[PDB]
Design an enzyme around this catalytic site. Structure first.
Site, PDB file in Angstrom:
ATOM      1  N   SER A   1      -0.570  15.532 -12.158  1.00  0.00           N
ATOM      2  CA  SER A   1      -0.803  15.150 -13.536  1.00  0.00           C
ATOM      3  C   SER A   1      -1.026  16.400 -14.376  1.00  0.00           C
ATOM      4  CB  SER A   1      -2.005  14.207 -13.624  1.00  0.00           C
ATOM      5  OG  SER A   1      -2.393  13.964 -14.965  1.00  0.00           O
TER       6      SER A   1
ATOM      7  N   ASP B   1       0.820  -1.199   0.000  1.00  0.00           N
ATOM      8  CA  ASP B   1       0.000   0.000   0.000  1.00  0.00           C
ATOM      9  C   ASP B   1       0.861   1.258   0.000  1.00  0.00           C
ATOM     10  OD1 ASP B   1      -1.901   1.916   0.338  1.00  0.00           O
ATOM     11  OD2 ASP B   1      -2.433   1.353   2.396  1.00  0.00           O
TER      12      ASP B   1
END
Length: 330
Positions: free
Chosen positions: A199, A35
């Site tokens: 992004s 994770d």
């Protein structure tokens, strides 16, 4: 040193991935959920309340000659889905794919929430975010990666998740046979303890690319792709019959519908998520309504590039003095 381990979807929908991990002496092998959105290595154990264990493999520290109680240490964590666990702490030898860390904090669960009990395939979590998120008190503990880092050939690990298939976690090296083209690296903020990046935009299907900054985290422990409502609305508008359902808790669509791809930007580069990756199947057994793999992050407080996004790429988690993230097509 290096390590290399295969990671395997827990079910036919890629709802999560498990990776075998050797703990203690003799080794006890547990299947952990790696994770990159948390920083605790915790396991089902011989200390876990009996009524809360249902099929999981447990760690028994009393059977390990290298286990040592971390005296006075406790831990308690809650995840974004409302699940939780807590307990005490041992140090022990932990190996992943041939890479060994001695003195790793292994957090033994005394309590787990129902969603953990109900999932027999996940024996615990292995956190790979920054150690500043580790919940051990009074002395915060380091992640497996942080502990291994100095010994690694290169201070990196890579995530190469499969679509409906196994993939690979590598530590300490970049497998140049595992991706196409080049790896594009992008800046990381560690201020919230995550692999947080920006992004450069998105496209829906064959549509034109929209240049827009989208902050978010690279999180292998989150299944879906969570993005701003504007972005997500633009995606599902291209799917015949799709709707946001408050009763179901997100966008659903008829699985007679064809899903467009979704492209996200990494610098001037582009990662394309095929439409099939965005199908998470019937909302209930036998239903013609399917759950979408791209959902709104509104209310979460952060955008999350979860497995839906990451499995479309070869992803480098670069833990150099200034961390960065790299993405390649594959």
């Amino acid at each position: 040193s290096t390590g290399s381990a295969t990671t395997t979807p827990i079910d036919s929908l890629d709802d999560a991935y498990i990776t075998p991990v050797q703990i203690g002496t003799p080794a006890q092998t547990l299947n952990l959920d790696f994770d990159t959105g948390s920083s605790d290595l915790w396991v089902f154990s011989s200390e876990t309340t009996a009524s809360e264990v249902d099929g999981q493999t447990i760690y028994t520290p009393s059977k390990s000659t290298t286990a040592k109680l971390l005296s006075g240490a406790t831990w308690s964590i809650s995840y974004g889905d409302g699940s939780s666990s807590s307990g005490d702490v041992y140090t022990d030898t932990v190996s992943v794919g041939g890479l060994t860390v001695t003195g790793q904090a292994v957090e033994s669960a005394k309590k787990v929430s129902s969603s953990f009990t109900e999932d027999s395939t996940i024996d615990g979590l292995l956190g790979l975010a920054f150690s500043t998120l580790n919940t051990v008190s009074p002395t915060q503990q380091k992640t497996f990666f942080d502990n291994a880092k100095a010994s690694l050939d290169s201070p990196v690990f890579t995530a190469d998740l499969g679509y409906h298939a196994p993939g690979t976690y590598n530590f300490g090296f970049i497998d140049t046979t595992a991706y196409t083209g080049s790896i594009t690296y992008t800046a990381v903020s560690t201020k919230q303890g995550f692999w947080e990046w920006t992004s450069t935009g998105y496209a829906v299907g064959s549509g034109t690319f929209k240049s827009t900054s989208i902050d978010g985290i690279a999180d292998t422990g989150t299944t879906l792709l969570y993005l701003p409502a504007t972005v997500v609305s633009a995606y599902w508008a291209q799917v015949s019959g799709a709707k946001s359902s408050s009763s179901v808790g997100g966008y659903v669509f008829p699985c007679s519908a064809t899903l467009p791809s979704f492209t996200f930007g990494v610098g001037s580069a582009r990662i394309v998520i095929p439409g099939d990756y965005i199908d998470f199947g019937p909302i209930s057994t036998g239903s013609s309504s399917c759950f979408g793999g791209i959902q709104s992050s509104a209310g979460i407080g952060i955008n999350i590039f979860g497995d839906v996004a990451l499995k479309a790429a070869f992803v480098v988690f670069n833990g150099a003095t200034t961390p960065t993230l790299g993405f390649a097509s594959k």
